[PDB]
Symmetry: C2
Subunit: 364 residues, 2 copies
Amino acid sequence: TSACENFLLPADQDGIQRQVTIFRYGQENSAPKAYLQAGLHADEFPGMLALKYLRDLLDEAARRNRIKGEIVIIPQANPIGLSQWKDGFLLGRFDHQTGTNFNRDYPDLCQLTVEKLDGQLTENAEHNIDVIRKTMRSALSELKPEQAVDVLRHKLISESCDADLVLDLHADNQAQCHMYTLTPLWPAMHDVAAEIDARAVLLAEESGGHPFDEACSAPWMNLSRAFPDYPIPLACQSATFELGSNDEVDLRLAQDQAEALFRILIRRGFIEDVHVGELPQLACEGTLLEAMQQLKAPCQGLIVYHNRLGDFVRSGDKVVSIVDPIGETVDILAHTDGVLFARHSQTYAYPNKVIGKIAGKEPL
Amino acid sequence: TSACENFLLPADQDGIQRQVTIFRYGQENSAPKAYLQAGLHADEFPGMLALKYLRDLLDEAARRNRIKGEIVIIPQANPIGLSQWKDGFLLGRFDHQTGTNFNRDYPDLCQLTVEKLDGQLTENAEHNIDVIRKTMRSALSELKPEQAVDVLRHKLISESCDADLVLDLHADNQAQCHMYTLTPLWPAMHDVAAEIDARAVLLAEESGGHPFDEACSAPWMNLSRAFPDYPIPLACQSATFELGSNDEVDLRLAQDQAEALFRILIRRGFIEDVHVGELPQLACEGTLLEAMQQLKAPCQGLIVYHNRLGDFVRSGDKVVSIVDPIGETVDILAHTDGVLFARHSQTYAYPNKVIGKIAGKEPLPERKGF
Ligand SMILES: [Mn+2]
Ligand SMILES: [Mn+2]
Ligand SMILES: [Zn+2]
Ligand SMILES: [Zn+2]
């Protein structure tokens, strides 16, 4: 009662062909559609173990015949990064062959569909959703990527663009559970943030060079703006969950995160004959990404933190110092009030290294 | 206060010349000699901060004119590794240019001196120590390394081989404070182990491919065996201190470790007009390296630990599992009673990855030849 696909990438520079294993729990192309992936950055582990245990919960839901939609699970979304060992360490953030970030350069499904949708939209929002989703699938079918990493990105967006719910599971080098989403999907995804116990929710309409979560949700916002004459709702509700620290692999945590993801699926109509009960209290407000402070090391040296992970800090507070063991010490200050939701796992800096993050409000 | 030397390495593949900063607090070639280095593995930080604070303590001792010997301090013994960033991470264990481990392929000063010492030894132990140390310095003078990493290794052993006390400050990926020394320097270095609060003391006569600590202490043991007709004491007392986890950078800890290193220097006659007092409780017995179990991942996957760092584990206990999130789970057991003094910081495995260490007392059948 669970489908398993092993999608084969083309051979890399060493002639090695890698596979993306994809699990599907429901009725193909039916009902509501959910997409959950982990390990796009192959060195970010908590999502991998969480989806292993979410599978155990969905295996039971399938046996009890309780799966209402199509639920797509990819515990290891990036088998290219997962092979990239150097000197005994897994470096899973950048592609060795291209040097590019695994969570950048996704297709713009607005740019690829605006031409095709010219005469296809009506006053019926539900019609527009089905037309836009079919157009997106067609547009992607016409693309012929060659590099393993481009083929990987292509498959992942092909299997997620038409979903109602998309959770990209990530981690930071040393961080509290936090969430990113498209600004206008707040407060729509309050329930998701609450269930996973996010300690920061960071909002943007456009962030970097076309990341995966924005590749899924942004097109609905940009098409709405392209065709203001028609009802185009934000049909694909995507978010990035930073579930914790890159190396935070704990049995209890992964089980708790799997249970939270299961509760999210129940709340959004993927699981039948299960009572959830009261939504947990959200521990933070949604804030703009533009209001977040990156703490940067102005020089090389030891990273000495004066604040614990998750401390509420005030503008002017000494948060972290760079200590040259054969030289000088430099103090680095908070420039905004907020929560120090991220630091770093490797306590040595190079100049301009991001060594921490504070979720602020941008007051005036 | 102190002498400061900036020893220049030859230019690397990008034409960049790196320097090793060396501090000296005493006279020269004087009294007892101490050598302390940190960051030979450039991604191992606790020793770097500890020696910065040990310098603060020695600056004050120098101002008060209380340094009795020569004390040599190198907080960052490896400026080659310290530059080796890849994808925003510091890879400080292996040399990019040679592929070699920074703490391997040191000179065998027994092999380099046995020929020269043929007719130089007498019934006077103290004479033999001075003869062997002078011979070691000469033997090293004759060597002409060309590659930056070989020149670096050469300088570090040249400035440490003739020391009475050598502490090579290291860290492990995720570990409790623990110590390695030459088997016959146990119990001699019980005081050192006690002051640094080692939770494991691991003994070997020869470990891997010629590491630094053994390069300093082994020659005395091997020369004693080469010339059994003469008194050759273990003149150079070396140990490796794994001070904690690679990224364990804490003000309190570095200050506590600096204070402990200072107390070791006082106990061994390097600091005047300071009394130390009662030796702290030793937390563990000295055990053989061959009695230590390396836990190895038999396959790739998530590393899921069932035991906390520092837990006492029994033979047969499930300590760690390798979990393929799209496959099977494999359980890994303790095969000896002992303390799980090390695990690992990066909780994903490749086959044969060492993912933990248990300090046992019974020698294990598989642990021969390291
Ligand atoms: Mn400081
Ligand atoms: Mn398990
Ligand atoms: Zn990420
Ligand atoms: Zn080391």
